[PDB]
Design a protein around this ligand. Structure first.
Ligand SMILES: NC(=O)C1=CN([C@@H]2O[C@H](COP(=O)(O)OP(=O)(O)OC[C@H]3O[C@@H](n4cnc5c(N)ncnc54)[C@H](OP(=O)(O)O)[C@@H]3O)[C@@H](O)[C@H]2O)C=CC1
Ligand SMILES: NC(=O)C1=CN([C@@H]2O[C@H](COP(=O)(O)OP(=O)(O)OC[C@H]3O[C@@H](n4cnc5c(N)ncnc54)[C@H](OP(=O)(O)O)[C@@H]3O)[C@@H](O)[C@H]2O)C=CC1
Ligand SMILES: NC(=O)C1=CN([C@@H]2O[C@H](COP(=O)(O)OP(=O)(O)OC[C@H]3O[C@@H](n4cnc5c(N)ncnc54)[C@H](OP(=O)(O)O)[C@@H]3O)[C@@H](O)[C@H]2O)C=CC1
Ligand SMILES: NC(=O)C1=CN([C@@H]2O[C@H](COP(=O)(O)OP(=O)(O)OC[C@H]3O[C@@H](n4cnc5c(N)ncnc54)[C@H](OP(=O)(O)O)[C@@H]3O)[C@@H](O)[C@H]2O)C=CC1
Ligand SMILES: O=C(O)c1cccc(C(=O)O)n1
Ligand SMILES: O=C(O)c1cccc(C(=O)O)n1
Ligand SMILES: O=C(O)c1cccc(C(=O)O)n1
Ligand SMILES: O=C(O)c1cccc(C(=O)O)n1
Lengths: 245, 245, 245, 245
């Protein structure tokens, strides 16, 4: 399988390149970076590409890939409904091509979102604390925003979190994601971490995921790369790829 | 509903007494303590009793209760297979009577065991850290031992945790519960806490439950008390009464 | 020693009342609550009063106390420079009277602020996460704000925390306290908790304090109550009371 | 300054080699590995060597280095009193040569031991939890054992930790290091982590250090390498080179 990496120079990209180069069943056909022509992909006859670039260019590359029938495993965050809809209104005019987008390829993270959904109804309060390296451009993380959305969707009928906050400094209570407060920590020495807190009478439940190394995203990426053709079109998250694993 | 409390003087017992006394749909019929005759129960026409005593007496009281057809919601730990088996038969001679035993009545704890079971297969390493007040007689906690057992049972076909420990101080690697290391911390200022750690390539997953107050066990207890008659015989755990599997 | 409690009905107040009532060397002379005349204090010939009321009334009571020469151990938060200055411009016109104000009476908390000050210079990043019960009116906590101030004051010559945040949801990065981000979590089941995070190349340092029970403030309060007369005027924090202990 | 690395192939060694190679003021004179002759050091005219090998060989290399007057910054754990004593004399016959041994070069770790010493007296209970990668040969970690020793030494006059443990599974309460329980966790995905827990009435204090990356040891190592000649003889720890006492 010929595989090319979009953003091969990035923190995550360089890792994926190393991973694909080590995969005995995969062939690194392309190593695109900022500026390099998207034609380099069609040159190496790439069939699947791993995208770990920037939200300002994803939509751009996604058009090219979907055109030449090249499959795509995208990790680049900042995917909005309109964008998904964009990607949607494209695959239709060129099926047989598969595209997978996931806010997090770490298995522990996917499991965290899974458990968060299940525990939400049993508690009065729910908050999300996300912590990342000081090089992250977006706050809060895509995963945090998605986790908050999942929680808020599971507590549909229930009342909102209890909060007697009368006086407060601007921003002290974090960002509001569908009624669920989300706090973003940018600290040196960190990579990718998340904490989901549920609280009730005399007890709390904490589901924490820690990505100590960027290699933690490899397994999920390669898994999606190999079984990419299994599902045509868009997928979103890698939950379907292992809900039975 | 007439409800009596066994061990009404204990740390947990005094809380249950207060809870039952506040329950508008429940009547505190008995407040037994160490020494007090089990006949006080039959005196107040008790139909259900909450047991939070000591493992050295549970079996004793359980016989009396099961005889007079009184239902029992037991929280007292130290329940072994033989003990469970014993109680099993005890009721077979007196059906129509219900008995529920649970290692933990905190919902977060029950959920922790639920999630632990589901995540076990996805990781290479698994360990349990349990932390309690310095007044606990047993180490590790009943919940910890049960959680470790659940994890070990979910990883049936998989190899054991990787460990290159060559030299070590006695007891440094905690207790072995079916191949899963369990560490017991006894610290002042704590109540009931547990941490389940799963580890793999570049990432870890932590599921932590915190019982900051003993009132956290009330909801689970009262829930079992009210729906006690729903399931005749012996029931181990709170899961059956919960939506989860 | 005759001791009266201001706000004897509050979550913390009721605890202090119980504590003073148990102190064999202390006499509970007053149990004021909302509405009750401040004259009840002068009635029982109170010499020291524990204040755990509300920031909207502290200044009021503080005037009365300082007038009748009654000593005061205040725990009520929301103490600003002007207010301190107010309390300052009063004791002068009536010395021989002592007043102690502390943002936190938990020893672990005081120690946390102590360590935070010492570690600040050794790290690139520093952030504060504070977590409290959903009944707290102010965000962030007084202790959190004070800890952030201490940290920012210790890193005087050093550059600010590195942060590449380009796009962000309003409030995601918490409140800014002298360049130190502070996050406030309001969750059910919690009491008083704080986490100080320091980060640098490949490592982080976390100093966490947990007030699982309101009784944790008793030792510090009573300590200040007994040795109150030792220092005339205002003090601020109970660091001087044990920097040598 | 000519610097050679002992164990240049190890997890930590390869990092130090990369670090020294990047240091504009340092020259990588040697890259010894298992088997390679210690004479390679005398070949490149090495003046200082970084040792990150194995406790079974340290004593061996230390003799050679101290003989040829080569300075040594040793990170290899497993240093016992007898071993320290031995090295002591080894240098007495060859002064003018400096040797520094430290159980941890991460600044956060050194600070942790510093704070642990200061907080010990203020609490009833104290326990240490250490967590490392599943490739560590010794349990508990050298740092954990040292931290436990420091704590036990600071609580000289005070009574031991309160523990009502009557029944227990073998090893559940961790290893005993001078009366301080130490728990060792070996999990995949981890690197080097430690947690010091202090407990008292209604509150706990946690001092946690996290080495997410092995690069975290570089700063401390290079600092000791450059200022090595400053202190003739043997030096244990990094504290001397630091502002702290
Ligand atoms: N879903 C997941 O599991 C994960 C997602 N991510 C997300 O992936 C993205 C990047 O990760 P990270 O490595 O930290 O990011 P980087 O800051 O390292 O940026 C990655 C690479 O993309 C580049 N690049 C930019 N534009 C193009 C382009 N048009 N064509 C090809 N290359 C381009 C960069 O070049 P230059 O910088 O010179 O412009 C850089 O080399 C973020 O959105 C991040 O949140 C990260 C980890 C995991
Ligand atoms: N399943 C769960 O969710 C939970 C289970 N537990 C378990 O429940 C038990 C209680 O712990 P905790 O309440 O903190 O401990 P305590 O010892 O504080 O409470 C125990 C009470 O039982 C007593 N008692 C002893 N024997 C009898 C008897 N035969 N008849 C009635 N009273 C008796 C005691 O008296 P005296 O002390 O004078 O002997 C004491 O009042 C433990 O086994 C604990 O592990 C605890 C919390 C939760
Ligand atoms: N420094 C420290 O270690 C700690 C400080 N605090 C601080 O102390 C304050 C309160 O603690 P908490 O118990 O949670 O608060 P509560 O919400 O329980 O309020 C406390 C009591 O003060 C009352 N009170 C109000 N005004 C007066 C008045 N003028 N005269 C006397 N009584 C009055 C209340 O009555 P009503 O509600 O009916 O008006 C209530 O009974 C807060 O500022 C909190 O942040 C808390 C813990 C520790
Ligand atoms: N003080 C501190 O801050 C730190 C201390 N340490 C300690 O340092 C040591 C290193 O751990 P780590 O690097 O992860 O382990 P590794 O085993 O990955 O690194 C050890 C290296 O030393 C080797 N080597 C063995 N004997 C010799 C020898 N006689 N001459 C030179 N090379 C030799 C190895 O070869 P081979 O494997 O083939 O035998 C291996 O390359 C441990 O004792 C660890 O506890 C670790 C981190 C920090
Ligand atoms: O959901 C996210 O935005 C996310 C998840 C993991 C890592 C990163 C990152 O390194 O930027 N971002
Ligand atoms: O599973 C247990 O043994 C357990 C759970 C909660 C509290 C206690 C306790 O207070 O002893 N013990
Ligand atoms: O610094 C604070 O504001 C503080 C500290 C401890 C407890 C509380 C509280 O219970 O409101 N508030
Ligand atoms: O004190 C120790 O033994 C220690 C400290 C950091 C890392 C390691 C290690 O990687 O073995 N060991």
């Amino acid at each position: 399988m010929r595989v090319g990496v979009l953003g091969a120079k990035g923190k995550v990209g360089t890792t994926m390149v190393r991973a694909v180069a080590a995969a005995d069943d995969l062939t690194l056909s392309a190593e695109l970076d900022a500026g390099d022509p998207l034609s380099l992909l069609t040159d190496g006859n790439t069939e699947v590409v791993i995208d770990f670039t920037h939200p300002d260019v994803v939509m751009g590359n996604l058009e090219f890939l979907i055109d030449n029938g090249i499959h795509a495993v995208v990790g680049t965050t900042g995917f909005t409904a309109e964008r998904f809809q964009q990607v949607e209104s494209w695959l239709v005019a060129k099926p047989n091509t598969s595209v997978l987008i996931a806010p997090n390829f770490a298995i522990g993270a996917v499991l965290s979102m899974h458990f968060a959904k299940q525990a939400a109804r049993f508690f009065d309060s729910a908050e999300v604390i996300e912590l990342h390296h000081p090089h992250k451009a977006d706050a809060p993380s895509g995963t945090a925003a998605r986790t908050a959305k999942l929680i808020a969707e599971a507590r549909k009928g229930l009342p909102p979190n209890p909060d007697a906050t009368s006086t407060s400094l601007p921003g002290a209570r974090g960002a509001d994601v569908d009624g669920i407060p989300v706090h973003a920590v940018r600290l040196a020495g960190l990579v990718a971490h998340q904490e989901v807190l549920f609280g009730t009478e005399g007890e709390t439940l904490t589901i924490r995921h820690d990505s100590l190394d960027r290699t933690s995203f490899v397994p999920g990426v390669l898994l999606a790369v190999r079984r990419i053709a299994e599902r045509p079109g868009l997928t979103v998250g890698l939950e379907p790829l292992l809900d039975l694993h």
